[model samples]
Target: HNMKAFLDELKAENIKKFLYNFTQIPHLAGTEQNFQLAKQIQSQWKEFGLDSVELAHYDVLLSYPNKTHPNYISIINEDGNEIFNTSLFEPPPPGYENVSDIVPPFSAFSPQGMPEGDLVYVNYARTEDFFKLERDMKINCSGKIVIARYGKVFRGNKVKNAQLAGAKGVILYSDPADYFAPGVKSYPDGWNLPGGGVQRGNILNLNGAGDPLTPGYPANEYAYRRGIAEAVGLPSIPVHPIGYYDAQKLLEKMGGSAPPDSSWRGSLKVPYNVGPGFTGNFSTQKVKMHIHSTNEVTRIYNVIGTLRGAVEPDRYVILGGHRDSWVFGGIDPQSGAAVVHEIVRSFGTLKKEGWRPRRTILFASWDAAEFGLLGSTEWAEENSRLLQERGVAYINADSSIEGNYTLRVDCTPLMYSLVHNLTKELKSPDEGFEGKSLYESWTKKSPSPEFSGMPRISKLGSGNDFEVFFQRLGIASGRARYTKNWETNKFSGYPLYHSVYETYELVEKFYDPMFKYHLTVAQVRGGMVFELANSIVLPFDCRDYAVVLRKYADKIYSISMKHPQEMKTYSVSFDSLFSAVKNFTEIASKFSERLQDFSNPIVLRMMNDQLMFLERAFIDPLGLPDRPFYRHVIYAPSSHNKYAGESFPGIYDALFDIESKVDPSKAWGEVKRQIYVAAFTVQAAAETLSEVA
Candidate 1:
């Protein structure tokens, strides 16, 4: 009853106030401002009556551009005279005229060099884009500086692909098609990005998460550190990011033929040409770019606040989000940060009334997440054993409010019903939703294809702080946020994402005018924490896991059937996998039936342990063949596309590699091995959940 009352006590006004104060300055990770913000969060948690608060510090390598010498791209003539140069900074929005400390536009972890050469346009810079350029289009990116738009894949993969194709450097830009709609007004006037708005981000493609200098371990004071040269995923080429304003200048001077497909073209006024050099009057000119960045070992803090449980203080339930951003981070992180603050304050109120949860609740404010999930990954690495044993779940709220259309959730199958039911109890904040519950609004917008009345809850993927908890430790983790309505607005993300125009005004006026969605997100987040912490039976559904596994297995089997000749040649069969899944499904159904008889305390504890260990059973200590850090066999970020989640990644990647004939026999052997691994993992999970008769 107290928890329910405290949920109503959450006020939008308090969230608005926190948002205004948190986004007033730029808080780039590893900077003094970011450190100060960490301290502020620590102080606020202490004041909120938390039982304990502490800052977990890690010393890791961080990259930054030199303030004295800004990085820029230029067009140079035959005589080495600069003709056109790109701007390296974005002007502050209207009301924020006094905003200072804007970091110059540069990709983090980019090597220092002045790489000048002929230019080429490679669409979105995906692997297929490079393949088309070399094989079909008869164009080569070798010895050229490739310019690609931002979308479809992680930015780090773009740089990596360019280097693999023998490119000397990379230049990335946000296309007008993706950021600025044809009829929409720009920022300060509307939510669309201005021509000068640049999306700044990190390009560290380390094939893993956390500090590159210390892989598979914490970056503590006593931890062994590897040299920078030994880091695996750092980009070897210099890369830079510019706005569409700078991109048009370079693209208009292209001399080659048009792109093969119109999809490669953006809304820019210039003709989209695949250039190897300049056109018109400057045919003899080349594109030159310079990047000067320094990487140094720095200290970052993770502010953790704990509210000890009255019954089970050893078991933990965590809620966290990254506290770093590329710029002001009004929409990317501060919005989520503000929501966390409100939830913590509400929990404090309940604690003051002599109420305590059954399990421990932890609120974490992570640092340096923009530098490749540094803070969260390092911390998770440090506490791998404890978390694997005692951690119940991790609920993340990164960028809690990106749009007001509806709530978007991504989680493992175990918590699908928990999150899905939580949405039904909360009222939709938007007036256009007609006061319907969030579940009603969500289903009305995007209904699931398989289930008629249900909305889709996507599988968790990489590119966020949840990567460590979900992928590495095999813990049940999830992320929730209000996202744009993709049915109407087809942009990759919100227009102002990671740009300088992502100010407090953007949230107040455009994203969440009344902060109701922010409040709603807080309610949903808090409710999840409440149930996970207080429930004696543990709200996890192993049947959902079995169902999803069957779906994944069927999809892969269907694909294999399409190419009978290849399957025959490889001597691979999906029958064994299907049989394994069938057995697991039967076992999971029996386990769900047994969950109803939670009468005895000893039986409850045993059942809860069984539920928690189901996810942990999927972890293979050896990890994926090459990507050792990602341990979960069922779900992982796609090796080719980091932004997309792949099921049975080992199998998917092996099949993809076999097509290229890199080593057909070796690839086939790995494919068979992965199938065996996946089948046994599912069988093991079922065994873990089965009651010992």
Candidate 2:
């Protein structure tokens, strides 16, 4: 009765669980129950006797929780019936407030606020269409807001285009029968959107989000939160999103040339509208706008649990998962959270058995990954120095579904062989998969078998906790998991990310609820932890790494030679490094094959030596091109896409920086030096491989 009453009281609002396939409600934002679930999962670590539990808190500048932009103008028909105008038809992005009085601030997220004007309906906000109306036809909107449908361009681009053409505010809306055909927003028995409902037609520049006035670093509360004028990524004019229910009313009131082209059609159930004088077309010339505060009361966290090693107590392999939520991010954090606890429980069981590892392993349950990786980001930044020195490797996993493919490692070339070797040992618990080696099976499955053929892990991207390590600086990082081995990867993978359907109930239906392959994931990661801790030589697969690095270098060198004008010193260096490492790999491969067969003392020594300099391959000691802390050469994340590695960063980034500043030869030479350094590291690994033998 109590539960029923509670449910009844909240009946008006949607209830959701973000499990595997059926998680996250659409349009509804963050909630508190979601957070409690994380807290509940974290409590399980005590059974593992983990050393510590903590919450690294970070703030998020959450968008309108409802995904509803209340900012709107009701256009009145001749009958005086008011109709709402929103992002149903967003004007071009890059709008210009100076040239047009028609540009009016539309929404809170919209950019310029001062100017306002009568809306001029331009069909859809494609640059070509807008240009034809304003530029080609010379029908300029000196002081007018422009109405255009949302299609063929980014929401931000839509607003920006109009800004440049001298319009003010921009509005985008969903058209029922057009873009989506049947329509958008109508919930069926089954549906989901990957990037937030076809990624709402708003023009918020996600890539360049930051406090006004500050570019890279945090602004606002950190440094007085500058006036709106100082912000770079902020939109210049007002903007907003509206439902088709409202868009139809406004389209009927429009007064302008018919919006040009077939592009203007929306998913609205009714025929689309374009016009100069329609029943629903009334216009608002202006509106107010400003920047709002997004504050962090404290840093977001990665709740870490430790299992000490018997020998190299300090050397560490870190594992983590984000314990944050987007509303109730169960599929995201909870699914993985269950895995984390399971691993911890098993490791704890082993720990009791006197199975101490050689290196310490830390299981960190992270916080705030949902909002710009705040918890992990600050954690990485705060302990970067210590992590660079003591950390051997960092392994992490986010949401995983039984989506249609066998899984693989997502890490850097530096640790390629180490992971490759681990792959050789994996045995999925699935019926026929149990006895087979993960690497052999996966390599066969991958496109190129001769080349390690196993699917190399995904490049670190902003999607998970791994970003903090690989992106901020080149910390050898990884996120490991099993996936659906289906012909179509989609069925196994969750189509509904960041939606209300991401629920435990849904996962029970679609995902591997019994966690059939989860135990395999446990073993895959567990064995690595145990092997690294106890093996005489650390599992440093320098030989394989050297080979991969050499290949990448060769590619870079060849590319550099082709583009003489675009060439630099690093390309040449990469070529040299490539040559050096390639030679090392051929010799090293033999030793690695029979590594476990070798005697301990000699193997141990070589392993220790390789690890000592392993980081130098990427870390500059002197620092990277611009960002000093980020020194690794092989992979590093971009400031923009922090989770994804900014591939061939050292040289590639340098050339991109100066904009044709240095000679190609010099660039190659520099890369060649690093290449050789990397080669030496590879040779060192081969030496270890040989030592064990």
Candidate 3:
């Protein structure tokens, strides 16, 4: 009864106030201002009646640009004319003044060095793009500076690809052709990035996750860190992100053996060319790219506040979003940050109304997330011993608004049913779908292969704070966002991602005009948090998990059937895997019936603990094939596409290596090993379930 009133008391005006306050200041990780904001958040939560609040600091490595000694990309003509030069700093749009705290454009962890050579244009700079350049153009990227257009994949992968191709340096830029979609006005006019805009992001830790220096360990003050030189995640080559205006200037002057394919063309007025040099008079001129940056041990803060549970104080339900941003991050981090604050505030109101949760709720504001999930991972690592025992679930809200038409969820199957059931009770944020619930609208509008009858629950990826809790500790985790409503088939991305233009004005003017979507998301998030914190029997439905596991088995079976000869070569057999998952499904179904019989407190605790261990059992203590940072055998972020989650990541990611013929037999062996790695865990979970029964 009080739950509804608690949710009802969640006012939209309060969410707006929190959102406005959070987005007002720049809060880059480890900065004085960032620490100040963390303290402010701590104080506010204490005032809101949180039981305990504290700032946990980690001595992790972070990178910052030297504003005085700015990174420069110079284009020199054959006759000694400098045709173009980079302006590293992004200028704010009209009506906004550039602050002293504005960070200059620089890629995080770009090693201090300079690499100048004939530049080669690689479209998007993906691994495939490199192969295309080598095969189609017959050009070697080695000993040459590679210029790549940003987007399509993580920036880390782009740099990794260039480094693999033996490139001397890398220059990354966002093309107007991509971000400023055709017919969409550029920034200051529309939400698209302007000519001077550059997207800043981390480029290290491509093959790894979490803190680099203290890999596989928490970055506590006394923790031993591997030398910066010894860190495998750091980039060997200099990498920098520049504005498209500088890119166009270099592209216009460059002329090579052949003009690029039509698909490789950008919206720049000058014709795009596959270049090792500028054409005609400037073909012989070389580009000079210089990056001056350094990394050092710095303290980043994580503000954590808890509302104690009346029933089970030891069990915790976590809710968090990163508190750091690149530059006045309005949508990227602050949007989600604001929502977390609102949720805390709403919970405080509920506490005043005499409502206490069954499980303790920990509200977190993580820092240094942009620097490869540093803060959260360190904290999670520090508490891993306890988290594995008591962490019930982690719910994340990263970048709350994309457009707010539909709720975008990326999570594990344990929470999938809850996500759908909750949405059915929540109203649509838009009037266009007033009569329909968010679930109905989502299924009708965005149904996929997995969502014919239920909601489409996909794998969680590595880009967010949940990476530590879910991927590392084997906790059930999930995250949600309100996405843009483009055409049924067409989608327009938020062009200002990671750019300075991702400010409050853009969010207020373009994304959520009335802030209704933000309020609606807050309601959804609050509901999920409340459900997990207050549920009596642990709301997880194991059948959904079984169904998801079966889906993966079926998918693999399809692959084996289509390519029997290929599977034969690898000696890959799916029978054991299929049987394992089938056994799991039956045992899970049996447990649903047993739930009614689990009245004994000891048995109930044992059953719930086993159910929680279902996710934990999937963790291979030895970890994934190559990426040991991700220990979960089932769900992991793809090695190639860092943002998108991969199911059976070990087997599937190994398939790519096999295709590339890089130790094909070894890769195949790894695939077969991982299949059992997952199956074996599934079997163990079933055994645990049998004990409960």
Candidate 4:
């Protein structure tokens, strides 16, 4: 790809320097430190001899814990006598004194309240869990305090599901089994959660993306906002987060008729109880919890640095990472922020050597990401017109590395071949695997079940900044991260996610002490950017999209067969989709076969534009049913979990959420409608490819 010299210029020392300097500053979004870091980023980009650098601001609504109020949970006996009281706090490790900078442990946007009610232990609080509680156990969830373990889904979904089940309050805790299982030790000693550790997160429903107050629009300075009462998906019930230290004590005291299923058991030494509280002994005892938080509008920053293209200034390839952290945010974001700076600096050096890209490259450090990806969402919304017309792809680097295991990726179908092709040339970083390439090691590490040549990439979900582009605007996007094994149920070596201990020290001590993995990730991600910027034809494969769509279509068809009576009345038109894909398959194969023959810049540009716009064709202006913000017809975050990716989300959610008593016809109709939408979108892309061919 003629970028060997550029790749050779990326230095490990420079990468570490960037990581050190970026984490040296406290970078909480909307805080002064984040602004200072943004300014430094702008200055550094200018020094790198970039064409332009700027800071974009978004005045969005955010929530903060009230300093005067603290999160607390206490047990009261049946006669109103207090038994146990605990504070939801995790003390900082020795030598770390940035306690004041820690945003207290509390769910963002949870309604402010202190309610007293009997505690109900709901496992994971998934929709199925709630269904079991209502159907099998005959437990009444109304007006009770629900205690749910953290795992299986986005923490917010747990709180939201409980609220809908008639719970008055919610408490979430991480089970040691998920982190510190049999062989693993707790952090400060090993890479697992300590008893006192707590994970703080936001609970904004996936009913939409972006600022809740300014739904379907950007939250610019002077933008109009709806009242809190009118906020679309903000939770109404009070919610709190607690460490396992307190959860164990609370769980032990409330005994129930039967224990949870063996699979539902956690690492706690006590028996796992599915509690509605014991009938006689202190079972009627009420638990009092208090959470004080205030929701308000705050200004956030998105630092942007650009390297204008010599050939195609309008076409853009963007690299981005969130700059904000709940605490110091060393792993969740600073690693990505560090990688962005290093990539910018490396490109700057290449610029000095008189090399120019074929397409514009943009580096973005986003703000307010910890509070539901506000900065990136609003910025993308404001620039929707230009981005839709000129955007090629968006690559994200949020939580860039959590372990040094196999490379983990969640990407759209078009980028599947691009990932494999680039990795095939890069050397593997593993010391034991001498002279091996990344693609070889990766394929060996996790081969596809279908023997698809290369390792399979996962679908994208809403966890980072890629959501706005990939899901909302139908731009192809992807993210590469160093994580545990693909099949490992537990998050191995992922300690202190979104906690006070997600620090530079922990990363150095336990995760990537030598920073070899960091440099490796940078190289892999940098290669992606370099090739995208310098290539004449954008690296996208439409046949891969067709293959993935065919699989999803088959999957839904199989799911339909399970409920024969329910699906009998419904008609899903996979025939039309199959034809569209067949057309795309032929055109894509022709383009690849005659790749060298199409050297004309005009012809190449036309082909690249069509490939870039292929994903755009998937969007329906009417938007996904009930969620206009998530417009992609083929793939989106599941309304059920929001963290897990769901293909054909409209159809999946409709069928997945149905109750036996409720008629399945409505769900069938929704699925049929969305299938038509997918068919039309696929048809548009097929026509584009046919024209280019």
Candidate 5:
């Protein structure tokens, strides 16, 4: 009865209205528009019959481009005469011509400078890409403005590697090979990026995922703050993002040898070269990149609403999405914001029908996520004690519907059974697969690697608000979205990701005309919240976690075996890790059988607490060797690539760096330590699920 009532209350028309309201103005973080929207959301939640609603504030370090002295790139001859210039802004798409407050394209936290030097092309600017340039191709990026395509890793890492290579500045652009397909037209006509589309993002990589000034603490008013100079993640060199239209101009005038191989070539209609200067008539010309960004300590709000439960008011199940965006953020976050609001309304309807959950539910609208997950991280830091004691799980819905092809989930292993079972209850949004469940469509499109017939649930990685909850606080978390088919469409993300062309009209006309996908996302998220908040025995499956742990251990074991010489040299052994995994699996099986008894209330409480702390047992107080902010030893973002999740990251990264280590003995010792850490963590998780005294 409760499920049917909540599901029936989710109307597509209501979701469309909420999405239009959210995308009506450009609400970037630390802006007046975003603050006003937070207040609006707060008032709406109160009106929707939530028990309590308030705006949590944080004073964080944010970055912005200087308005009067706009940033740009120029070409200068040896005599200092300006030869060419680029317009550092995108022309508004149709129906957005009158929108005046659109933020110009610029990377956040890029220092103000006008660095001029000879031009060079560094494809992707990855660490190995630079190493290959010096080692294989015999090229140097010293004192040159390196131009790179956007893909493979985080955008900030690109700038970091270039700065490490002694480059004067960096230019990042979306290559047509990644953003445009064979016959796809540009935006306002089709679902392809225009030549002028630039992807603006933050360039902070020092602390991984928090306000740089306040590394492990909350960014509150009276909190002790670190000086900006002490902050580690800030870029020292100027960086700029441009479109392929402008990048083509630079590539066409390059003079140098070709790339090391065909992989360095993009779809730009020009010969790719590893240049140290311009070609033809502009041979004596140099490239000048300018950045005029300013940093400030500003206030942002996280609108938090709570629904008190009847049986266990202390335990919490949180549902969250960020409200801040770059430009209108039609799909990057506002779509998810729209879904959050509808879920709130639906749950409030259930409350009015005289229904109360077994555990508390928190609806969070995070702020300043684009500035490196500031709001959520600060909040999690502030409430670390209470959350670790009573937090059940976190469900994230950021940009819930980027595409309609299939459902994608990135989650902790504890949530695998919950997600798999939930998808079976909902119908597919695509009418093409009439009467089919979302699970059927998802399994057919993306199958699991471990299980034969189940859909894949990816491991969680850094990018959104979940990073703080799961990686830092050890809360079991998951994010669900409907993404485009990567096999067919090779766009890096949706064509208009974080661009001026991302508007409500684009979502209405091209992405989800009927809002069915949005409704389906809302249903999935709402259902997850429902089951997690109301279940008697906390629906977390330790067996799934144990199985996934074995997979991770086996994969690493194979990797170590591949390099037998290194294994022998380091004296690394996975025997203890294998024993820990087997013990965990056996204990988890017994725990699963014990959960079959739901009669004794005292026994149920003890079992639920064990389930709640199973994921927490993996966290180490000291965290990894270098990255202390991420406390989870089992899963963390890859140091080289932020978007990809690493299993037993400490061990994997140590192994990955063995070849490049300056000191072989110390590197091998570190690898051995990481293996013991992983093994001990697995054994501790097993102990958490053992019989209570």
Candidate 6:
């Protein structure tokens, strides 16, 4: 959404020039103005100029394009006198009686609208006791609204529980005790839930990202380019979360109900209730409130910069991060963005000072990342052919932090040592943690008593803009940082995430270590930029890639044994695919050792192109069995999950989507497509090894 204004406001300030207003970016809904802000940040970086441009775009999940329907409900006793302000679970039209003018809670992903009746307080899980209240106690909630507290489980689990027990709508509220904690310094009088404030979102279970209906594929050319409203994957019922203030009133009115598990407690000054209530009456219609204005762009773009090389100019080593935020995302983007910007400047400065490496670098600032990597995917899809042939590597920076910890760089069989060296050379903010390289700090059997030094380099996943680049394109890549959370003081204040209290004020009071890590990040990132650009030996290690792949194979083998039937049917294809995967892994390992024998920049750059797609062997351009076009070999967001992504996509979602309608198993097209993906990764690795050194 629109994160530009916030970023613009933040550009003038560094950690040295701090702000303390990080309350979930003021508003969380994906807005047009926020998307525009993403664009503005991209433009700003592009204009700032360091290298040529590149992009990482993918599918994004937007709650609403330009529509809203809030949910608010009214409670009435036998005398019909209202007890408290209506909850935010009632609707406007379909369930008019339940709500007066209040917009429905989370309608973008579901079609249930705002249906209401008698409410059942299910005490978190809606467990066995919950059923007793519905069946034994004879609490008929056929039309009543259900209100539950957060924590016992995920928010979506609550919605599903109510629907199964014959409740109309679901209302979720954060209990102050567990949710609100100490050391959190965002709110004026400390972090307390505001009255009537609601937590809004879809109850989606997607593990891979993008849009809900259009899983495994970009939306630009999806199913006749249908608009967001026509998009499927809406929710089964309306769901909303209010602050404890709104929840306290609803709990006080409920009467005949059992107590909750001992684990349940809250900061609200009321007894927690599991309710059927005496008699519910006097339905609500609607109510209204106004939001301050903000601007967001309808169209978002990924910023790209390139430095063509002598031998492998077309092939690339990409660096990326999301430019958009849920709010003024200073820590998330500013920390990560600052690193990328600094790299471009350092590289440009080097080039001006007579430095030209053998390989090209593609620095991209992804857009629609907050939504689900929108800008990167579409651009990747649009330039699939070019990327397939030329893309060599991707270095992603999803979100940087301010903690003084080890660095985590996710890459393929190659580049492990390169990153290890970079981490070792970086600085840390804490004197105990300072000057401790990632290797000296994290690689020992046990960390030093002082807890200073680096941690292991982690493998990359679908959470960032790297999805399309690595998962889809099979490019050998990784996510980089100096210390794991050393860019911003995020380690101290993560508890406020996704809450109304996720403000900058909280960051300064609790997150940042007095602007110490900011400079530390700058120096380390600046060093990394120069080292990678000038390295004579292409940083590619095959052994690590093989180790990770071997693990995946073992897990896949167990899964196959458990599902013997599916295993038997697909044995031949699976065996061949796995064999190719194993062979590539072995060669990749040997290739790392092979690197010891070479120093020719031209050969290294040429070889790097072949190594790029090694991670993407699992993809089929047609996507998972039924889900064609989700080109990456890995899994993507789920349709049933509604905007959330799933891992191991083709195998997992194929059956799930199959039961819904199209059976991906029948659509062997995708499995067949993965053959080429596997072949490509192997080929790239082999080519890089044979020629580079």
Better of 1 and 3 by TM-score: 1
Model 6 per-residue lDDT tens digits across residues 439-535:
5544542243323553455445454677677656766656654443323332212333343333455445544546444444544444443444445
TM-score on alpha carbons, each prediction: 0.98, 0.65, 0.96, 0.96, 0.98, 0.68
lDDT of 3 by residue, 1-693 (tens): 445766786777776677788877678888999999999999999988799999999989899888678887888666666666888688876655646687888999998886668888898888778888987779888898988888777888888889999899998988877777667677767788888988889898634456788877878868998887787588899999987787887777767756557878777886777778777777678898778887878899999999999988999999988999998888988888888888898888877777778889999999999988888888988898889999999998778897656767887888887888888988787667887888887776667565475555568887888888988889999888888655531322578888888888888878887777887788778888888888777778888888888888887666546656768887888777888899999988988888766547777777778777778878878888667778887788777768778777776765563565667677667778777777887787677777542
Error (Å) of candidate 4 at residue 441 is 1.1
lDDT of 4 by residue, 93-135 (tens): 6566555666778889888888998778888899888888888
Over 4 Å off, model 2 = 1-42, 56-82, 85-191, 194-301, 429-437, 449-453, 483-494, 561-606, 621-630, 638-646, 653-693
Candidate 2 lDDT, 506-558, residue by residue in tens: 34544554555454555565555555555656666655566566656665566
Candidate 1, which segments miss by more than 4 Å at Cα? none
Residue-pair clashes per prediction, in order, are: 0, 137, 3, 0, 0, 103
- Residue 200, candidate 1: alpha-carbon lDDT: 88
Model 2 poorest ten-residue lDDT run: 6-15
lDDT of 2: 0.50
**lDDT at position 339, candidate 5:** 96
TM-score of 2: 0.65
Residue 575 C-alpha lDDT in model 6: 60
Best-matching candidate per lDDT: 5
Poorest lDDT segment (10 consecutive residues) of candidate 1: 656-665
Compared with the true structure, the alpha-carbon lDDT of candidate 6 equals 0.50
lDDT of each: 0.87, 0.50, 0.81, 0.80, 0.88, 0.50
Residue 164 error, candidate 2, Å = 11
Model 5 Cα shift for residue 161 (angstroms):
1.7
